[PDB]
Motif scaffolding. Structure first.
Motif, PDB file in Angstrom:
ATOM      1  N   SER B 113      -0.955  -2.059   8.538  1.00  0.00           N
ATOM      2  CA  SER B 113      -2.001  -1.945   9.653  1.00  0.00           C
ATOM      3  C   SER B 113      -3.052  -0.464   9.511  1.00  0.00           C
ATOM      4  N   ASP B 114      -2.166   0.778   9.666  1.00  0.00           N
ATOM      5  CA  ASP B 114      -2.664   1.990   9.671  1.00  0.00           C
ATOM      6  C   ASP B 114      -3.753   2.364   8.419  1.00  0.00           C
ATOM      7  N   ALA B 115      -3.999   1.284   7.593  1.00  0.00           N
ATOM      8  CA  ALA B 115      -4.986   1.418   6.478  1.00  0.00           C
ATOM      9  C   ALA B 115      -6.617   1.290   6.734  1.00  0.00           C
ATOM     10  N   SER B 116      -6.292   0.024   7.544  1.00  0.00           N
ATOM     11  CA  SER B 116      -7.683  -0.405   8.286  1.00  0.00           C
ATOM     12  C   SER B 116      -8.480   0.509   8.818  1.00  0.00           C
ATOM     13  N   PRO B 117      -9.675   0.579   9.155  1.00  0.00           N
ATOM     14  CA  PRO B 117     -10.524   1.357   9.821  1.00  0.00           C
ATOM     15  C   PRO B 117     -10.535   1.108  11.459  1.00  0.00           C
ATOM     16  N   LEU B 118     -10.099  -0.288  11.774  1.00  0.00           N
ATOM     17  CA  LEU B 118     -10.184  -0.431  13.242  1.00  0.00           C
ATOM     18  C   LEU B 118      -8.717  -0.081  13.694  1.00  0.00           C
ATOM     19  N   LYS B 119      -8.711   0.204  15.128  1.00  0.00           N
ATOM     20  CA  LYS B 119      -7.504   0.594  15.739  1.00  0.00           C
ATOM     21  C   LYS B 119      -6.649  -0.824  15.434  1.00  0.00           C
ATOM     22  N   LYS B 120      -5.168  -0.589  15.319  1.00  0.00           N
ATOM     23  CA  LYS B 120      -4.115  -1.286  15.311  1.00  0.00           C
ATOM     24  C   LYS B 120      -4.444  -2.596  16.364  1.00  0.00           C
ATOM     25  N   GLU B 121      -4.451  -2.698  17.440  1.00  0.00           N
ATOM     26  CA  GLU B 121      -4.759  -3.541  18.293  1.00  0.00           C
ATOM     27  C   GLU B 121      -5.887  -4.391  18.158  1.00  0.00           C
ATOM     28  N   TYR B 122      -6.961  -4.201  17.195  1.00  0.00           N
ATOM     29  CA  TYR B 122      -7.878  -4.909  16.930  1.00  0.00           C
ATOM     30  C   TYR B 122      -7.697  -5.935  15.509  1.00  0.00           C
ATOM     31  N   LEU B 246     -18.616  -7.742   5.381  1.00  0.00           N
ATOM     32  CA  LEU B 246     -18.257  -7.015   6.617  1.00  0.00           C
ATOM     33  C   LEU B 246     -16.581  -7.312   6.844  1.00  0.00           C
ATOM     34  N   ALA B 247     -16.304  -8.755   6.775  1.00  0.00           N
ATOM     35  CA  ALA B 247     -14.984  -8.858   6.865  1.00  0.00           C
ATOM     36  C   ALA B 247     -14.064  -8.138   5.613  1.00  0.00           C
ATOM     37  N   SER B 248     -14.222  -7.886   4.582  1.00  0.00           N
ATOM     38  CA  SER B 248     -13.601  -7.210   3.481  1.00  0.00           C
ATOM     39  C   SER B 248     -13.143  -5.811   3.888  1.00  0.00           C
ATOM     40  N   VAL B 249     -13.691  -4.944   4.922  1.00  0.00           N
ATOM     41  CA  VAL B 249     -13.173  -3.643   5.388  1.00  0.00           C
ATOM     42  C   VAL B 249     -12.242  -3.763   6.365  1.00  0.00           C
ATOM     43  N   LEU B 250     -11.880  -4.865   6.972  1.00  0.00           N
ATOM     44  CA  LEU B 250     -10.852  -5.077   7.997  1.00  0.00           C
ATOM     45  C   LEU B 250      -9.389  -4.802   7.388  1.00  0.00           C
ATOM     46  N   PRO B 251      -8.887  -5.153   6.247  1.00  0.00           N
ATOM     47  CA  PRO B 251      -7.551  -4.862   5.812  1.00  0.00           C
ATOM     48  C   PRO B 251      -7.590  -3.121   5.310  1.00  0.00           C
ATOM     49  N   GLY B 252      -8.566  -2.497   4.894  1.00  0.00           N
ATOM     50  CA  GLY B 252      -8.755  -1.039   4.792  1.00  0.00           C
ATOM     51  C   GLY B 252      -8.462  -0.877   3.270  1.00  0.00           C
ATOM     52  N   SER B 253      -6.987  -0.930   2.978  1.00  0.00           N
ATOM     53  CA  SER B 253      -6.407  -0.758   1.766  1.00  0.00           C
ATOM     54  C   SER B 253      -6.897  -2.120   0.919  1.00  0.00           C
ATOM     55  N   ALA B 318       7.013  -7.761   0.077  1.00  0.00           N
ATOM     56  CA  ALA B 318       7.110  -6.798  -0.824  1.00  0.00           C
ATOM     57  C   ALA B 318       5.918  -5.683  -0.592  1.00  0.00           C
ATOM     58  N   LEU B 319       4.921  -5.905   0.063  1.00  0.00           N
ATOM     59  CA  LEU B 319       4.108  -4.688   0.279  1.00  0.00           C
ATOM     60  C   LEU B 319       4.749  -3.926   1.357  1.00  0.00           C
ATOM     61  N   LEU B 320       5.541  -4.323   2.082  1.00  0.00           N
ATOM     62  CA  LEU B 320       6.364  -3.408   3.182  1.00  0.00           C
ATOM     63  C   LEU B 320       7.117  -2.912   2.328  1.00  0.00           C
ATOM     64  N   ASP B 326      -1.845   2.610  -5.425  1.00  0.00           N
ATOM     65  CA  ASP B 326      -2.783   2.581  -4.711  1.00  0.00           C
ATOM     66  C   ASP B 326      -2.757   2.519  -3.123  1.00  0.00           C
ATOM     67  N   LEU B 327      -1.571   2.447  -2.604  1.00  0.00           N
ATOM     68  CA  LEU B 327      -1.351   2.195  -1.426  1.00  0.00           C
ATOM     69  C   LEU B 327      -0.320   3.213  -0.790  1.00  0.00           C
ATOM     70  N   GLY B 328      -0.019   4.597  -1.415  1.00  0.00           N
ATOM     71  CA  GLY B 328       0.629   5.534  -1.132  1.00  0.00           C
ATOM     72  C   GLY B 328       2.192   5.030  -1.491  1.00  0.00           C
ATOM     73  N   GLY B 329       2.508   4.406  -2.611  1.00  0.00           N
ATOM     74  CA  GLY B 329       3.640   4.125  -3.079  1.00  0.00           C
ATOM     75  C   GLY B 329       3.719   4.531  -4.494  1.00  0.00           C
ATOM     76  N   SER B 330       4.802   3.868  -4.990  1.00  0.00           N
ATOM     77  CA  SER B 330       4.761   4.438  -6.679  1.00  0.00           C
ATOM     78  C   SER B 330       5.218   2.960  -7.588  1.00  0.00           C
ATOM     79  N   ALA B 331       5.347   1.835  -6.967  1.00  0.00           N
ATOM     80  CA  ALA B 331       5.512   0.494  -7.667  1.00  0.00           C
ATOM     81  C   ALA B 331       4.557   0.163  -8.400  1.00  0.00           C
ATOM     82  N   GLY B 332       4.782   0.090  -9.951  1.00  0.00           N
ATOM     83  CA  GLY B 332       3.644  -0.541 -10.449  1.00  0.00           C
ATOM     84  C   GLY B 332       3.691  -2.029 -10.667  1.00  0.00           C
ATOM     85  N   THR B 333       2.926  -2.739 -11.306  1.00  0.00           N
ATOM     86  CA  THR B 333       2.670  -3.991 -11.367  1.00  0.00           C
ATOM     87  C   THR B 333       3.874  -4.729 -11.563  1.00  0.00           C
TER      88      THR B 333
END
Lengths: 345, 345
Positions: B113-122, B246-253, B318-320, B326-333
């Motif tokens: 959630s915190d990677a998205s451009p929108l506030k969490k609630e949206y 436009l919809a592809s910016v909602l995930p953020g990451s 797994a993402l959690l 690329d999402l501030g972790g270190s786990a490769g493929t």
């Protein structure tokens, strides 16, 4: 400074008058020569004169140097026919004054950051103006049709129509941060190659202003990911219309936004927001968009860019000091018009 | 389950193989009968076979029950002509398998959630699928043209083309929350009245699924103000194309998103994201979109909706647990493909 004032229906009287209260203060203070006259327009003129734009008003907007328009519309009229309903008049004043570009500014006022849907960091410093061509392309373009088999519609633009909205854009640019972005679909459609080369020819004459081009789908993503990167955006009709509604969610606390139609005749300025009949008379209406349509008149009708920015600071300051009820405060129209004035003294 | 696998260029080998690693686990575990074969496609086949979609591959995708496509493209080829460059092949496989609808899902995974451009609630609970008609309308429609004077382009649709993408939409709907929204400009354009009545005729046959209609400009505002309100959205080409970016910016990451082309032939599934040559071989590529294009194959090619959702939970989990670099972790493929598998055991 000659203004025909058309306050319209519902809240139009109240919030158009708080605009005039700011304008009579600057007028006093700078001696701008404001001469205004109120004319009938809308649901009120259907009742009074039996049509929404009576010829006193036709003449009035024809001869003033600016129109300050409020808002029309009311359920009362919908039932009676078509050319007797508030909104018809809205197209009649557009046709008459030969208006062809619609300017829509979006600003996110640091104090209402938390109202926006985007995280703070994306809205910080948004200040941009989309100027949408108003009279051409697929909504009006032809051929068009519908069969049991199929349906058709042509996006069509001639060089003149592209150069018109492009000059407004550059000239609009000169008065604020000097960058134009034109928006098209040039990599797929030829209307868009055309639009693209013509905006680039016209740009040659305005050397002090920077020009860039973007595709509608990439600019739809940029208005949410980095909207603080644009100054003026100029585009066609349906894309201006789509990208202005996406851009209107960025402030969050809606109702605050100003609009201006420009062209050969008399520029019309109005708040984006309608009549709001529910609340006419109660004194709570938020005037932020009327006071900012006035600031747009001063900037576009009279070229007084420096006063337009000082009225946009007074309303910024004022929004910070006394949020209206609609933004979790309690300052009605008058108390809010007050602190606006109290800042530009 | 017969899959022709076309891993493409750059990172395509690496992330297409982590998809197959999830699929061979489910296959083992449920006995689904995965038979796959790897075929040449793209920059690699230009080098190998002297064209981007060689007839071994033409045959392969023609005869499999699904294509798992990776990514093509590399600077190397751009300079040589036009029909010898990776991307040409991308349209050749679309033409051949007669694919006419492109499904693009957007989900925002509570952990990013915190990677998205929108506030969490949206963004909370965004899960929607836009299915964009792929082969018709203004990009392909005619007449079209460009003169020194003007430029033209026709948005055109026939009943058959509207009913095709509409059935995919309803059937796509049955497998997730049962609500379709069709998107049009019906209140101004007639192509859109047409689109509107036809989506409403076709909707009669799918009673268990709810239908609603919206205008492109109101749906552009809803994807930022309330995007968690939609399940399947079906629209035409340029509006699908604008509203999917436009919809592809909602995930953020970014980088996490899957795509699927559907139609008369063999469905093609692929990650949205290209080749990424910069990082082929290093082992850090994020496989979240390949593993989720596989989940889309299982849902659309084989109808195994229940396994597709369990692979979308394993990748959520797994993402959690192990964000990729690329999402501030270190786990490769590989380490990321691991914990995905470690969840669906």
């Amino acid at each position: 400074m000659k203004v025909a004032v058309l306050p319209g229906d519902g809240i139009g009287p109240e919030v158009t008058e708080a605009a005039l209260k700011v304008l009579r203060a600057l007028d006093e203070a700078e001696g701008l020569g404001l001469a205004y006259e109120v004319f009938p327009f809308g649901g009120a003129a259907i009742d009074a004169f039996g049509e929404p734009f009576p010829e006193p008003t036709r003449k009035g907007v024809e001869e003033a140097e600016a129109v300050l328009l409020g808002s029309v519309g009311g359920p009362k009229w919908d039932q009676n026919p078509r050319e007797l309903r508030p909104e018809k008049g809205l197209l009649s004043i557009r046709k008459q004054l030969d208006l062809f570009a619609n300017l829509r500014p979006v600003k996110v006022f640091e104090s209402l950051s938390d109202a926006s849907p985007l995280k703070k960091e994306y809205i910080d410093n948004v200040d941009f103006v989309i100027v949408r061509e108003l009279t051409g392309g697929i909504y009006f373009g032809e051929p068009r049709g519908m069969s049991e088999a199929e349906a058709w519609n042509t996006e069509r633009y001639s060089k003149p129509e592209v150069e018109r909205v492009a000059r407004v854009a550059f000239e609009a640019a000169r008065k604020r941060r000097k960058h134009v972005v034109s928006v098209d679909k040039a990599n797929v459609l030829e209307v868009g190659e055309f639009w693209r080369k013509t905006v680039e020819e016209v740009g040659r004459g305005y050397p002090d202003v920077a020009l860039e081009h973007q595709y509608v789908d990439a600019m739809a993503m940029h208005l949410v990911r980095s909207p603080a990167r644009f100054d003026v955006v100029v585009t066609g009709n349906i894309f201006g219309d789509i990208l202005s509604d996406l851009a209107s969610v960025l402030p969050g606390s809606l109702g605050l936004l100003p609009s201006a139609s420009l062209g050969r005749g008399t520029p019309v300025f109005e708040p984006v927001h309608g009549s709001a009949p529910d609340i006419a008379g109660k004194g709570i209406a938020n005037p932020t968009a009327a006071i900012l349509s006035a600031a747009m008149m001063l900037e576009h009708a009279f070229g007084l860019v420096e006063l337009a920015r000082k009225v946009e600071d007074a309303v910024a300051k004022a929004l910070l000091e006394t949020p209206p009820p609609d933004l979790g405060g309690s300052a009605g129209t008058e108390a809010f018009t007050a602190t606006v004035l109290r800042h530009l003294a």
